[PDB]
């Protein structure tokens, strides 16, 4: 039973049924395709079905380096003792490195433009090509590895290939941890939930379970509410890059050819920095570029990402809204009126009640994103508890956390405290004007922007052994 072409409900498929008067799909014999997640124990009549995490739960830049041994060695340049990641062998972005090409059997990136013949990129995670903005972030971190490896080879001539790669990998991972917990998370959670769920780091506790919880794979999809219906590219004066400044998202999905043959990563990074996020509002949850036309170029029908989210939660056997509220120690509304108070929105509580019958049944992503946002945060109380709890676990339960004693020297921690995403963008692109920190708040050029000369470079002096 091919889930992509068939609408039959048999394993491993769980197609999404289409209601009457759907605004796009007029035939109710049609479906949105859906493959059930792989079970941790297939065919068992003992275990309660659980799903697999193919990646390392740790904030360790596994999207750059990979989570499995054969991938990880194949991502490395084994042609010298310079400790580098492998780079594209056919293309360069105005003389700067791109990701290598992958060799898949049914490569979707080829389907996005049959004329360009540009395949998907090979990185540590399989989704690197999903949108060119993501590809740009992956390419950036590939370059930073390669830059740090080069300086380490000059600072320490005795260091071999393996030493150079590992030391450069350790730094990159700490940079992801610093940007995430210092810059990103306070803006997700807001100060009241940051203080409550992520109090000041003490040290490594080997009794804190660092696994990703099944609910997190769905809750953290809150991000789908932040998605703008275009990819925005800007030239060196931050002004629209013609002839296509705003490409609709449904024509960028797996459009790896746009990085390769339409300007590189510079115009994409500038657009990320100088375009606002979409704001999540209770009557403006998610755009039709992802609700109607997700992956339209690469398959027979356009997907519905929010609907896929709700289907996935059921597939994963995730309890509903009230059960998660109770987990988080938050009151659990039972009537439309109580749901109305909790949402501060009776109109939305009524829609949710007509759909779900009871707030007990509201699917977690839907309940989660429906809640009013915390002050200075971008999630409601439920999501802030779930995301917060996961991140505190990932920090307190990681023996290689950057602040944990012995991972770095005292002088190395002091230098790493100076890093920033703007400075990494400076050091690895042709971009000379970047966002003032915090890069995740700054969105308006020229007002929120500064010269790369004003930002201090990371000091690798404390990595010299001499």
């Amino acid at each position: 039973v091919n889930c992509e072409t068939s609408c039959v409900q048999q394993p491993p498929c769980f197609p999404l049924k289409i209601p009457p008067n759907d605004p796009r799909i007029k035939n109710q014999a049609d479906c949105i395709p859906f493959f059930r997640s792989c079970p941790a124990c297939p065919g068992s009549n003992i275990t309660i079905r659980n799903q697999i995490n193919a990646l390392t739960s740790f904030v360790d830049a596994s999207m750059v380096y990979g989570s499995e041994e054969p991938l990880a060695r194949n991502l490395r340049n084994m042609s010298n003792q310079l400790g580098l990641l492998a780079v594209n062998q056919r293309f360069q972005d105005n003389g700067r490195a791109l990701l290598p090409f992958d060799n898949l059997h049914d490569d979707p990136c080829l389907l996005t433009n049959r004329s360009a013949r540009i395949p998907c990129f090979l990185a540590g995670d399989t989704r690197s090509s999903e949108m060119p903005e993501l590809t740009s972030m992956h390419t950036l971190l590939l370059r930073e590895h390669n830059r740090l490896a080069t300086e380490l080879k000059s600072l320490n001539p005795r260091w071999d290939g393996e030493r150079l790669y590992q030391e450069a990998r350790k730094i990159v991972g700490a940079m992801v941890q610093i940007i995430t917990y210092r810059d990103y998370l306070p803006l997700v959670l807001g100060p009241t939930a940051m203080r409550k769920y992520l109090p000041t780091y003490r040290s490594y506790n080997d009794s804190v379970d660092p696994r990703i919880a099944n609910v997190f794979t769905n809750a953290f999809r809150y991000g789908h509410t932040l998605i703008q219906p275009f990819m925005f590219r800007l030239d060196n004066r931050y002004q629209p890059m013609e002839p296509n400044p705003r490409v609709p998202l449904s024509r960028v999905f797996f459009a790896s050819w746009r990085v390769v043959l339409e300007g590189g990563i510079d115009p994409i990074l500038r657009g990320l920095m100088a375009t606002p996020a979409k704001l999540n509002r209770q009557n403006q949850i998610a755009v039709d570029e992802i609700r109607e036309r997700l992956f339209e170029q690469v398959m027979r029908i356009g997907l519905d990402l929010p609907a896929l989210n709700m289907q996935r939660s059921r597939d994963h056997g995730l309890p509903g809204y009230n059960a998660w509220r109770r987990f988080c120690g938050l009151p659990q509304p039972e009537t439309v009126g109580q749901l109305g108070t909790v949402l501060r929105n009776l109109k939305l509580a009524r829609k949710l009640m007509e759909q779900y019958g009871t707030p007990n049944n509201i699917d977690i992503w839907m309940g989660g994103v429906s809640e009013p946002l915390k002050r200075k945060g971008r999630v409601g109380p439920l999501l802030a508890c779930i995301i917060g709890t996961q991140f505190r676990k990932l920090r307190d339960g990681d023996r290689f956390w950057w602040e944990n004693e012995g991972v770095f020297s005292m002088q190395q921690r002091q230098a790493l405290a100076q890093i920033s995403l703007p400075r990494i963008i400076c050091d690895n692109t042709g971009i000379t004007t970047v966002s003032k920190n915090n890069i995740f708040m700054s969105n308006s050029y020229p007002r929120d922007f500064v010269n790369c000369s004003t930002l201090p470079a990371l000091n690798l002096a404390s990595w010299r052994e001499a």
């Binding site: 990646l55 360790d60 759909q355």
Partner: protein, 104 residues
């Protein structure tokens, strides 16, 4: 696990020395609440026609999306206090944390 190691393993194995697969790749998710399946152990809610969840009909995911999520794009609110880079770092970070396999 080795007694000493300066760097992470690629799989995440040995980060926790008492339970060395915690946070390692290709392992089951931890559950913070027991699973809720239509038959109690494997079939998802909405799988079988007429089988209710907590005594109410299961709502089609596509119908909830049509009724609550759908909005005209011309109403879109730009976030004055967040860049699109805030969206993109979230995705990138998600990609450092989890990927739930499905059969090909």
């Amino acid at each position: 696990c080795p007694e000493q190691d300066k760097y992470r393993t690629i799989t995440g194995m040995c980060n926790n020395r008492r339970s060395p697969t915690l946070g390692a790749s290709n392992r089951a998710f931890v559950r913070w609440l027991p699973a809720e399946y239509e038959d109690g152990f494997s079939l998802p809610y909405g799988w079988t026609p007429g089988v209710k969840r907590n005594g109410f009909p299961v709502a089609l995911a596509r119908a909830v999306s049509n009724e609550i999520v759908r909005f005209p794009t011309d109403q879109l609110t730009p976030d004055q206090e967040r860049s699109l880079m805030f969206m993109q770092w979230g995705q990138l970070l998600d990609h450092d944390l989890d990927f739930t396999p499905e059969p090909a």
